[PDB]
Design a protein around this nucleic acid. Sequence first.
DNA 1: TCACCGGTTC
DNA 2: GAACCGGTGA
Length: 145
Amino acid sequence: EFMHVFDNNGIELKAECSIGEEDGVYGLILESWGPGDRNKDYNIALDYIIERLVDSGVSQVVVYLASSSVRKHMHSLDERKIHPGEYFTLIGNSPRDIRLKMCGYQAYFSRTGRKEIPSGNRTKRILINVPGIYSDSFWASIIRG
DNA sequence: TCACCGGTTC
DNA sequence: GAACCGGTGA
């Protein structure tokens, strides 16, 4: 029932995902890491996603916090956008460093709202959008490798 | 039961 | 500061 991200050798990572419309936004949803080994390749899978997006000519994305808790308590889609600007930038650093910047923003959320000081888990359920892309074929290529 | 993220371990 | 564990409330 869940799709997965595949590594550069075509091996399936422990990283559940799905492609579709959620809260009016079309994109890739990467499921959360935890407990234990549930989706433990979150970070590697997300590194590949960023790298492959860049190789496909995508320089900017929009990333929403999409955990059941945050969706429940933060009704505003604009507030659920993890980064302060309109877009998040995928170029100018290594895919790893870009991920660190991206996932640092997840630390500003709690169960019920935003925080002052970022803390806690950074590997939560997120929705990545590429502006102008409404196609599962594109996203299929990105997660397949 | 399950995905949630707080909080400890790296 | 980031990776990971596992306790938690629904």
